[PDB]
């Protein structure tokens, strides 16, 4: 039994470095040598109570690539939770008596953690719990960063945009902070800054981090430029001034960008990255998404398969 067998993937905060590396090493193995029937007789629930394109499709595609079946919903408007008023607890109590695993994305934070208390030995994978965590997204980012930078330590990482409601940066920052000598450049408007708990944590580990008002400033030192979208669906009325993109990346802003540097971005983009960047060698958000298939195949394999992949 590998370390991740039958474990809940809820928060990066609960995962070790050995766990993350375990996932990436597995993704590479499966990417190199596919295993079409690894999960042959498994049925997995794909429960999206919140909108999604890349996460649900890649996850569901990953499952099929491993031979497992998928059931679920991509809108809590057809479930008895919305059309008949039901608690997440009751919904999980029943679904967990049907399936072998539950991948879930929820609008409220804590949903995945709440879910584990109601799914007796049926693994729960957090596909994002409203602005809090997004573990798998980080596994995919780790994989990609490694693929293009050759490593996960001693890197200059900049995260731009909505960092307060960005569940992706919360996980990513915590994960990269588990490795040695990484430096963070946070570029986001005041009203949407990086939560104190992430900063305090960085300090406790002696990790170096700094704030900046523009991308140009850090553009020549960054190995990874992680752009993000403003979480308009999680903003409070008194923050609607930030709904628009304050930081826009254009093909020209990359003239003095390191050769190796790669631009990433959990894809739902709304002009934070001008399409003219797509053509440059630095654009890497579409290949990033593609890495979702490998990171997620490895995760499912480790969670639902006791013996490590050969």
């Amino acid at each position: 039994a590998n370390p991740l067998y039958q474990k809940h993937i809820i928060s990066i905060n609960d995962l070790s470095r050995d766990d993350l590396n375990l996932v990436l090493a597995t993704a590479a193995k499966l990417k190199a040598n596919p295993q079409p029937e690894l999960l042959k007789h498994k049925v997995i629930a794909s429960c999206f109570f919140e909108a999604s394109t890349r996460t649900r499709l890649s996850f569901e595609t990953s499952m099929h690539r491993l031979g497992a079946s998928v059931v679920g919903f991509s809108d809590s408007a057809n479930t008895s939770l919305g059309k008949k008023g039901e608690t997440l607890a009751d919904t999980i109590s029943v679904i967990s008596t049907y399936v072998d695993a539950i991948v879930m994305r929820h609008p409220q934070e804590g949903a995945a953690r709440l879910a584990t208390e109601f799914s007796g030995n049926v693994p729960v994978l957090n596909a994002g719990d409203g602005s809090n965590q997004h573990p798998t997204q980080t596994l995919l980012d780790l994989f990609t960063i490694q693929e293009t930078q050759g490593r996960l330590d001693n890197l200059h990482v900049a995260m731009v945009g909505d960092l307060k409601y960005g569940r992706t940066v919360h996980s990513l920052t915590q994960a990269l902070a588990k490795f040695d000598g990484n430096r963070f450049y946070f570029i986001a408007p005041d009203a949407l800054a990086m939560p104190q708990y992430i900063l305090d944590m960085l300090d406790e580990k002696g990790i170096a981090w700094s704030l900046h008002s523009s991308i140009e400033e850090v553009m020549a030192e960054v190995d990874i430029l992680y752009m993000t979208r403003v979480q308009k669906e999680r903003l409070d009325p008194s923050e609607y001034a930030n709904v628009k993109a304050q930081f826009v990346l254009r093909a020209s802003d990359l003239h003095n960008a390191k050769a190796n540097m790669k631009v990433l971005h959990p894809l739902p983009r709304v002009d934070e990255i001008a399409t003219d960047v797509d053509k440059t060698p630095h654009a890497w958000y579409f290949q990033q998404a593609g890495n979702g298939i490998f990171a997620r195949q490895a995760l499912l394999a480790l969670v639902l398969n006791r013996d490590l992949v050969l």
Binding site: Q108, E109, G110, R113, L114, N132, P195, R234
Partner: protein, 153 residues
Amino acid sequence: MTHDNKLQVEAIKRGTVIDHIPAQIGFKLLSLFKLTETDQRITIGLNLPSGEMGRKDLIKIENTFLSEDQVDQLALYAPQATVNRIDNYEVVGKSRPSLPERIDNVLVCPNSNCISHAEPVSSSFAVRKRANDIALKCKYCEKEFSHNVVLAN
């Protein structure tokens, strides 16, 4: 025993004596801990002259020991408070409340979007010391606040 030596509050037989409670805090603890919901004798002194602090609140409850009534929690509202177990009119036990790793049930997560609200679950926060401003990390939403934002909800 303990007679009066210029200290107008020193007398009880077996029970708990919560001393050094900061002013305006003695009435809170009485409330949160539901300390008065009992048939036992309770003596309470508010705004007592404290050569120790300046002005302190003091509570004495007979035949009642607060070990499972969470000295844990008490560590939050009255950090400097001292708890003495009494017996035969004498202080057989004395201690300082120590900060817990967590607190369950009592509190309520400030986060209005936390899953904890609409669901069948008890609250829980991980306690952590910063600087005269204890931070609390919600078990579910994982967001963190100050005890002054959570306790004064």
